[PDB]
Design a binder for this molecule. Sequence first.
Ligand code: HEM
Ligand code: HEM
Lengths: 131, 131
Amino acid sequence: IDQKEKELIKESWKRIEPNKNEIGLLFYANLFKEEPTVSVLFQNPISSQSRKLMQVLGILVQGIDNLEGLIPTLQDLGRRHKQYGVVDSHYPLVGDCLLKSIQEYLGQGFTEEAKAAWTKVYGIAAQVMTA
Amino acid sequence: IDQKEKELIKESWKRIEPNKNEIGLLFYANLFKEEPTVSVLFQNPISSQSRKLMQVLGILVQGIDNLEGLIPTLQDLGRRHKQYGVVDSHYPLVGDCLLKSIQEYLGQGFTEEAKAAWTKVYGIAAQVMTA
Ligand code: HEM
Ligand code: HEM
């Protein structure tokens, strides 16, 4: 993750953040449509789950200049995900759905370059969570 | 619906409307989780579908004093729904999911009385769409 990618993440978060409630919920609607077998894993209210997911994305943006500082947080999260029935092959599916949902909601407000940067950041977060 | 119910629809819409995008999207997430097979009927972007659904709810509120006047509009909507592959048994499922999603997003901000009014209004709308 180079300086340019870090900037694109900070810059695009300024448009994601004000829209984060909708983006998170759109993500879950899209996920449950696209991957009908993962919805059974979610046991708590989706409204609160969406808030939790977007909160963590904001933490990734806040720590984007030093992600290594987030390895422990992410390792704990990955551990809980195993307890939720999540498996390694879920991560690419969730990543694609999240990025596509941001793209859908923001349209021309979200560049291909920003999409690529978020893809790398997601890939990193997922690698840390799956060890 | 009676006068008190009309007033409840109008007053509770003041809380639903500013949150209508989120409620719509939560509704689709909840619907797709409750009945995963139903998602195949939805071919267009969920973000735009949620907007359209909540637009019609706003029309129901706008016309709440004279629902009779919306019968043609609802009949046309019901006709298009038949084309989508929607059938009678879908209606209770969707109503339950919609009401529960409004309740979930607003919590105690959605009063028992308002929820009872909206339940009746949904039933009337469904009845007209399927007559
Ligand atoms: C970088 C990727 C991801 C992030 C940042 C993330 C974030 C979160 C957060 C913050 C929570 C709240 C609970 C907790 O903190 O332990 C959560 C719960 C959950 N996540 Fe993820 N997640 C990711 C990937 C995934 C994947 C790939 C799946 C696969 C389906 C998934 C499914 C779930 C489930 C089932 C729960 C528990 C829901 C419940 O409370 O019942 N997540 N996730
Ligand atoms: C009062 C109840 C309902 C309302 C107000 C409503 C509203 C709408 C609206 C405004 C649209 C946009 C397209 C159009 O105007 O024809 C739509 C599309 C659609 N609705 Fe409904 N609807 C209701 C019930 C249902 C039910 C019970 C189902 C069962 C699954 C359903 C499934 C669909 C589908 C599959 C589409 C098309 C999606 C697409 O274009 O890909 N709706 N609905």
